[PDB]
Amino acid sequence: KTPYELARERMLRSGLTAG
Amino acid sequence: KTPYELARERMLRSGLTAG
Amino acid sequence: KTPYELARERMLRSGLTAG
Amino acid sequence: KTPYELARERMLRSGLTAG
Amino acid sequence: KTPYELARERMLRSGLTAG
Amino acid sequence: LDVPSSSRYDHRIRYVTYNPADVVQVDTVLGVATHIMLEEGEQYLTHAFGDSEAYAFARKGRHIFIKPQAELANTNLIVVTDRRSYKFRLQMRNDRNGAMYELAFRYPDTQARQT
Amino acid sequence: LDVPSSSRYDHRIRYVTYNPADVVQVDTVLGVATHIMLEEGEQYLTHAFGDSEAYAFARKGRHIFIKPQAELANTNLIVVTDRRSYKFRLQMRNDRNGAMYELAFRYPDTQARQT
Amino acid sequence: LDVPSSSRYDHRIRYVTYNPADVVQVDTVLGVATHIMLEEGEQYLTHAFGDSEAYAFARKGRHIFIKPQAELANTNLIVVTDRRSYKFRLQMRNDRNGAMYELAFRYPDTQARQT
Amino acid sequence: LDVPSSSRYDHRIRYVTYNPADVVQVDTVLGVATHIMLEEGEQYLTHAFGDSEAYAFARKGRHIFIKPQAELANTNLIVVTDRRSYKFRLQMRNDRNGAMYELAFRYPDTQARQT
Cβ contacts of residue D8 below 8 Å, gap of 6+? Predict the structure, then answer.
């Protein structure tokens, strides 16, 4: 909920390259 | 119902060769 | 129900080769 | 339910090679 | 539920290579 | 009614001498396959069970496997070949003891032909 | 009924001398695959289980793996080849101890042929 | 039952001398892949798990990776090749300590052939 | 367990000397990709994660990027090539400090071959 948590979830979720 | 009766029904029912 | 009975049913049911 | 039982069911269930 | 348990389930679940 | 004779090592390996005018007694037990082997060069023609659903039959070449499929599987089996016909009285046992794993035939008719 | 003999290193590697008139005792345990290896140059023809659903069978060439699939998996196995037929009495154990990983055959019939 | 020996640098790299009459003890832990490497020029034929769903198997050439997939993953693995068969006793650990990353085999049978 | 050494400019560039009998410690942090570069002319064969879903793997040629995908991403990585196999102990950090951007290998085995 707090933007640090959403950022951390985004960092875990993303790949090395966008596609 | 009794297993003798089921055996007798099986003996009547079956053919000479399985197939 | 007892595992001896289920084993006996399995032994009657199965073929000589699995397939 | 107990993990020994689930392990035993897994051992019975599995084949010789995964596939 | 606790993140150690979810991590342990993930470790059991995953393969050697992603695909 | 000829009762096969056991080997000196194990009772599960049994022998019988073939007789065209006699029937071979085969004791079948739960969960045991019996291997009956025909004579070399003998060609299978047909078989007949007195009750097909009581036993399972599998053959490849001169090798025959039988196995009970049902309760009280008491029937007969006749296998006819080029040279002879075999008569088996299949009698299911109750105590799962004294099983027969293979039945081997000693043929004195071919021995008489050789004589 | 021949009981295979263990190696001096581990009890899971067992040896038996082949005898056409005897049956080989195989102790199977939960979650263990047993490797039975045939003689070199021997061709598989057929096998038969006294209970097919009790065990899993896999073969590639002269390598056979068996593995119990069910509770109380007590049956027999017969494998017939070009040169011989093997008789196994498969007896599932209860305590998951004394497993057999490989069974290797020593053939004195070929030794007698050499003699 | 042969226990592999660790290297002097890290305990995760272990060595064992091959023995056809013995079984190799492999300690597997949660979340760790073990690299078993076969001998050069050795051709994979078949493998068998005593419990396939307990472990993951991947092979490319002479490189084998295994990895537990389930709780209480205690089974055995047999890999048969052109030259030999490997016997592994796979025993899952509880504390995620003393992992094995690679197992390397020292073959004295080829050394005896050279001798 | 070899801990890579940092450069004199930035701690995010780290060096380690290759040892076939040792494991390389890799500290991974949140939101940071690590570039591991193989030796020139070295051909990738296979890799294995002790936990594939914990890390992301990308490779093009001799360039490997890894990146944690999950919480508590503590596993191992083995990359096998034509010439060697690399052993990495991947340990996720908590404070997002002391990241590793590249890991470069110094190979003394090729140096010994040159010697």
Answer: G30, G31
User: Do G58 and D12 lie within an 8 Å CB cutoff?
Assistant: no
Measured between alpha carbons, how far is G22 from I110 in angstroms, rounded to an integer? 60
Rg (CA), chain D: 9
Kindly list the distances between the CA atom of residue C9 and the CA atoms of E1, F71, G71, in Å, as whole numbers in the listed order. Answer: 42, 10, 12
Q: In what order do the strands lie in the sheet with I44-49?
A: I24-28, I85-92, I75-81, I44-49
Nearest to F57 by CA among F18, F98, F28, F23: F28
> Per the CB < 8 Å rule, is H12 touching I87?
yes
State the DSSP H helix or E strand holding residue G71, giving kind and residue range, or none if neither: none
Q: Which of G33, G65, G70 sits opposite D12 (nearest CB)?
A: G70
Overall size of chain I counted in residues:
115
Q: Which residue reads 């640098």 in tokens?
A: H9
Q: Which of H8, H9, H69 to mutate: most I Cβ within 10 Å?
A: H9
Q: Which residues contact F3 (CB under 8 A, 6 or more apart)?
A: F16, F25
E and H make contact (3+ CB pairs below 8 Å): yes
> Residues G31, G21: contact at Cβ < 8 Å?
no
Mutate to test the interface with E, among I45, I49, I52, I79 (most CBs of E within 10 A): I52
Looking from the CA of H2 toward its CB, the CA atoms found within 13 Å total 23
Interchain touch H–I (≥3 Cβ pairs closer than 8 Å): yes
CA–CA gap between residue F113 and residue H12 (Å, rounded): 73
Phi, psi of I111 (to 5 degrees): -65, -40
Q: Which of F59, F1, C2 is nearest to G48 (CA)?
A: F59
Is residue H105 a contact partner of residue H39, using CB atoms and an 8 Å limit?
yes
Rounded to whole angstroms, the Cα distance separating H2 from H15 reads 10
Which approach determined this entry? cryo-EM
Cα angle, residue C15 at apex, residues C14 and C16 outer, rounded to 5°: 130
Q: Tell me, in Å, the resolution of the deposited structure.
A: 2.7
Question: In angstroms, what separates the C-alpha of H82 from chain I's closest C-alpha?
Answer: 22
Continuous H helices in chain H: 108-114
* Subunit contact I70:A12, Cβ cutoff 8 A: yes
Q: How far apart are CA F17 and CA F15, in angstroms?
A: 7
Long-range contact list for H53-56, CB < 8 A, 24+ apart? Answer: H53/D10, H53/D13, H53/D14, H53/D18, H54/D7, H54/D10, H54/D11, H54/D14, H54/G31, H54/H90, H54/H92, H55/H28, H55/H90, H56/D18, H56/E15, H56/E16
- The answer to whether F28 touches F91, Cβ cutoff 8 Å, is yes
Cα separation, B14 vs B10, in Å, equals 6
F96: number of Cβ within 10 Å: 13
| Whole-angstrom Cα Rg for chain E | 9
User: Checking DSSP bridges between strand H34-37 and strand F13-17, what pairing results, if any?
Assistant: unpaired
